[PDB]
Structure formats: C-alpha cells, structure tokens
Design a protein around this nucleic acid. Structure first.
Lengths: 88, 99, 101, 80, 101, 90
DNA sequence: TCATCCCCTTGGCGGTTAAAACGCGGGGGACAGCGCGTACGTGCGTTTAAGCGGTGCTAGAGCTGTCTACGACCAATTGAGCGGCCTCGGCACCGGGATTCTGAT
DNA sequence: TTTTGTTTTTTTCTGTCTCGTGCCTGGTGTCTTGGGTGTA
DNA sequence: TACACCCAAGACACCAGGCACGAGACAGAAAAAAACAAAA
C-alpha cells in the first residue's frame, strides 16, 4: 500500500503532525482512485490515437483533462520536472 | 415561577450546530445492520457480512441522506418556507436524476 | 524514485500500469509522471489537512480534517465532487433565513 | 421483519439537523425511510452481484466499494 | 455469427475485445454473449422506432422516432439517462399548472 | 472506417421488412452500440481485475449485463446470451 | 481380550438498561383574501445580419517510405517493508470553574 | 349571437425506396497443436 | 490443486453477396377549399 509514502510526504510537508489509520486509508483510497482515473484516461487517449504505448504525454493530457486549472498546471509542472530529472 | 422554556427555533439551530460540528454516526448500528441483512436476504439467502462493509454502507447512506436533506432544505427555502415537505424531496430527487 | 527525486514508488507504479491492462507497451516517463502527480496531490491534501488540524489544536490528522481540507478548497472540491469521505462530516453552513429575525 | 422502522424519528431528525434543516414536518420521516430503503436496495443488489461473481458467501467491503463506485457514490477509507 | 444464430459479427467483437485493452485473454463465449446482448438491444430499439414511425406515417426511421421510442420506455430511458440524442427533441409534456382553467 | 450499419440494417429488416432508416438514425444507432460495447467491456474488465483473472468469459459478460441493464432488459439479454452460447457450442 | 427419598446439575420462567410516543401548554406563519403595482403581450413599423449561392485562396493531416533506440525478455545481484516485537503518549471522559444567548420584567 | 382554432377532403411534384448490377472482401472446408477449463 | 480433453489461433485454399452507382416510381407535405364544436 501507499502508507509509508504518504507518511513520508506528510513528514516532508508537516514534520510535527501525525495521521490516524482511517485517514491513512482515506489517503490510500484517494491515491488509488486518482491512479485508476489517470490510467483509464491515458488508455483512452492511446486508443483514440491508434497508439499501443503510453508515454509521459498521455499522462500529462490525462492530468490536464482531469485536474482543474491551477491544480492541473502544478501537477503538469511537477511531472515534467520529475521526467527531466529522471531522464538526465 | 414558570420553568424555563426555549422558543421554537433555538434548540433546532443548537442541534444543527452540534451535528454539523461532530462527524459521529447518527444512525444506530444494530437496527441498520438488521435492515441491511434483511435487504440482502431478499436477493440471496444465507449471506455473511463483514464489519467494514456494514460500516461503509452506513457511512455512504448517511452521506447520501445528508445531501438529500441539504437539497430538501434548499428547495423548501426556495419556496419561501421553513418546514421541509415531501414535495421538496421529490423535486430534489427529480433534479438529481434519481427519478 | 531516487533518480527522479520523488517519494512515491516508480517501479510499483510501473508494475501496476503494466498489470492493469491499459496498453500493450508502457514507457519510462509515464510512471514517473504519474508518481509525481500523485505525490503532488498527496502533498497538497496533507498540507491542507495539517493546516486544518492546527486550526483545531490537533496533532493527528483525522477524517474530519481531511473533509475540512477538501470541502474548503474549490479545486479539491471540484476534483472530488462525487467523492464521499467516511467519518468526515460536512461544513458548518447555516442559511441566513433560518437565523432568528 | 419490518426492519425499515429501525431508522426511527430521532435518527431522521439528526440526519436532517446535520444537513441544516431547522423545521421538520410529519410526512418527512416516511419519505426519508422510503428513499433510504430504495438506495440501500440499489446498492445491495450490486453488492450481492459482485459477491456472487466471486463465488463467495461473505459480502466484503471491497464489493460494497465497487458497487458504490459503479453507481456514483465514491467512498474512501474502506480499501484496506 | 451463423452458428450462434446472430446477425452481429462475432469475429469483429472478439477482435475489438482483444485489441481494446481490457484483458490479457478473451474467452470463446464472451464475444457471442456480447453480440447477442447487442443484437437484442438493437432489435428492441429498432422495433420501437419502427412502431413510432408507423404511428407517424413514415417508412423510415428518423432521430425523432428514436427519441420518442427511447424516452417512452421506462427501462430504455433509465439505461440511456445520461445520453443526448441529436435531432431527437424532447417529449411533448406540458404541466397541468400551465394549462388554462 | 468500420461500422455496424450493415448489421443494424439486417436487424431492422428482420424486425420490420418494410421500414427504412435515415443516416442520422444510423449514426445514432452506431453510437449507441459503441457505448453499450464500451460499457460492457469496461465492466467485464473490472470484474476480471477484481478477481485476479486475466480471462474474460461469458460469466463476466453476463455479470456486466446484469449490473448495467435494469430488470427485464437485463433478464432478456441474459437469456438471449445464454441461448446464443448454447447454439454456438452445439 | 471381546426400588423410594435425596444432593444437585441441565432445561425454561422471571428481572434492569438509556430515550421517545402520548398528553398537554401554545403560537408563527401557510393558506386564502385585500389590495397596490408595473413590464411587457400582442400588434405595427422599420431595419438588418443570417441564408443560399457562389467565387477565389491556401494549408496541413492521410498516407507512403526510411531510419532508429528504448522496450521485452534473460541470468546474477541486492536492499528495506511486512510481520512481528517493543516503547511511548493525546486526548475522551470526569468535575469544576468561567462564559453566554434568551425569555420574562 | 358572431369570430376563430381544429379537423377532412382533390391533385402534384418531391425526397426518397428497392431493383439492376460489377469487384472483391470478408464468408467457409481442412491440418496442427495446445492451453483453458471439466470434473474430481 | 491434478489429470484429462477438445475446439480455437494460425494458416492454406476456395468462393459469394454487400454497396455504391442510376432509375422508375411511391407515400406524403404543401397548396387550398370546405367544414363542425368549443372558446372567447
């Protein structure tokens, strides 16, 4: 599950703040739902373009279509930064 | 001396604030569990249920009922009324797409 | 995860995307992008929940804090419109016509 | 038998107070119980279908989550 | 198609299910079942549309006929509740409060 | 560009030998068939992924039809699918 | 090795636990009516940008060849999460002190 | 008591409907082998 | 979880009506008069 990762993210954004088990389960369910939504949108975008490979462009388009406005812009910027850091 | 008596409207708003500040389950556990088991028995006999599934069902039902009550209060206030009526619930369920 | 500077797992996301039956081939940048987006969303939600908990003199994030963080944010409420949070409650909103005149 | 009466008047009153309802009429409780029964039946039908598709006799929380997601009531905190 | 007694193609449905990114393997009865369900739905809809066209004195099916056939049926309207039919219009329903006297 | 116009016309001639269909109605029927296909395929894929199964058989399609179609429509579709499967297996 | 009493332990008939439907005091306003109020319904006159039909200009995806490198699949290597074990404390519940809208004067 | 919506009855061209018909593309037999169930 | 088993995926070889291109025609909107119940 995404328990240790959510805990590390919380410690990064709030060094003096805990999280209960129900909140951890809610965060894991939210992460899984976002994962499923973005994966389905990327698969649909790849099937609409006669493509059999999902790249970073499909995920960026899925994020721009799902997330609204500033959230989508910030997520796209973070994903582009992560991709440029991983490819280098 | 006449004992204290609150006018119609004070304790209602007090309970509104109390139940909007707290997030506890307002529906009892045993009657809701019995109702869920009776409803599931009509579809398939001899069915077992976990505590997490019943809790999720209760939470979803409570959230849906809270949303429906919000829509009903909005419809009642829109009609220049304070008390809610079944017509408001029908209008809310018709606009939401359930009926 | 270490090469991209992210806390979310990259190999796990890649394996999930490969086993989820979404496409025939999966690139190397798509799991990194998805992990980065998930990490940013989780960070925003956790920061808002921590702010809501500090506003209530609480040191542990409870579902009520998550509900107050999601409902108060406009973009988070638009993204999670049809999402129900268990044990989160609602916002303390009272109409003006119901107040004593 | 007749378990729909379990949702008594105080439960419906508390659920209305949580939604911001100040005054409640008399014919509200019956309609609320009917709508709750309809919603519970609509969810439990899909839950039982999902459980029977897995050849199981115990309705787990995952089946309820899937039945609520396939309808339009995404619920969190019950995937562990 | 000829072996199952259905006019809808079975090989095309199987190919679409194989290349549709749904599962790693597709069974032999799943395309037949899906084609049979699609054929039954299409037959019901086309029969209702033909009845509506005969009620409109026309030997052809127009989007108005399809709309009048789908919106009139309860289960068909429940299945296509979030479906918008182009050039189909709406049902000629007028409330009793707006009527005179 | 593939389409189910021929099969829709055949079904119409089967249910109504003396009734035509316009181009817009044909496109609407094609869109309806595509939407039903996509919905049933997605439901079957979800049912297969929930059970850790990589194969989609007639049971998954029957479950998807029972979950999507409501009541009498679902029952009739299940009966027609079972009859077609029995006729194809024999 | 293949018949009575009688002490009392297993069956079914009697007791407290946490809130609301009658029973009553009762009143704020929905319903129906009085009465004031003004924006445009419908018809006319007048003006115009969409419709239909051409008429002339211009680019970019559909489709066809060419070249390519990260994607898939194979043998070694390896590292911290899970399960489990051990430590530690935040606040729900208790009870009292301090604070506070609300009705009656 | 008189003016105005609603329903019935002629043709007449009018957008469309099935027939006539050629190319080929997807509509059928036959060998192999084997992996997804059938039943236990 | 185990032993068995049998029609499909693949591939070779052979074969038949759809579908769009025209055409004679086919039920119908319109053009227009004339006529009955209900509304104002």
């Amino acid at each position: 599950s995404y328990s240790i990762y959510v805990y590390k993210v919380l410690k990064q954004v709030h060094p003096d703040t805990g999280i209960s088990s129900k909140a951890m389960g809610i965060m894991n369910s939210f992460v899984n739902d976002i994962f499923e939504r973005i994966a389905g949108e990327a698969s649909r975008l790849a099937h609409y373009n006669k493509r059999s490979t999902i790249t970073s462009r499909e995920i960026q388009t899925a994020v721009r279509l799902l997330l609204p406005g500033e959230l989508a812009k910030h997520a796209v910027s973070e994903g582009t930064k992560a991709v440029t850091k991983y490819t280098s | 001396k006449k004992p204290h008596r609150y006018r119609p409207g004070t304790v209602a708003l007090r309970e509104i604030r109390r139940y909007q500040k707290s997030t506890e389950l307002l529906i009892r556990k045993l009657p809701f569990q019995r109702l869920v088991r009776e409803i599931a028995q009509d579809f398939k006999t001899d069915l077992r249920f976990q505590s997490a599934a019943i809790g999720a069902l209760q939470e979803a039902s409570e959230a849906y009922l809270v949303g429906l009550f919000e829509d009903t209060n909005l419809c009642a206030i829109h009609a220049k009324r304070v008390t809610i009526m079944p017509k408001d619930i029908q209008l809310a369920r018709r606009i939401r797409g359930e009926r | 995860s270490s090469r991209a500077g992210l806390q979310f797992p990259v190999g796990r996301v890649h394996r999930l995307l490969r086993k989820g039956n979404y496409s025939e081939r999966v690139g190397a940048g798509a799991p990194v992008y998805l992990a980065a987006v998930l990490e940013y969303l989780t960070a925003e939600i956790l920061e808002l929940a921590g702010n809501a908990a500090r506003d209530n003199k609480k040191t542990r994030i409870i579902p009520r804090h998550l509900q107050l963080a999601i409902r108060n944010d406009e973009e988070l409420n638009k993204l999670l419109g049809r999402v129900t949070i268990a044990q989160g409650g609602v916002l303390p909103n009272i109409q003006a016509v119901l107040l004593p005149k | 038998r007749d378990n729909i009466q379990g949702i008594t008047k105080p439960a419906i009153r508390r659920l209305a107070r949580r939604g911001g309802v100040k005054r409640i009429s008399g014919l509200i409780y019956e309609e609320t119980r009917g709508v709750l029964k309809v919603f519970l039946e609509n969810v439990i039908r899909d839950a039982v279908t999902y459980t029977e598709h897995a050849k199981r006799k115990t309705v787990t929380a995952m089946d309820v989550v899937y039945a609520l997601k396939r309808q339009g009531r995404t619920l969190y905190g019950f995937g562990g």
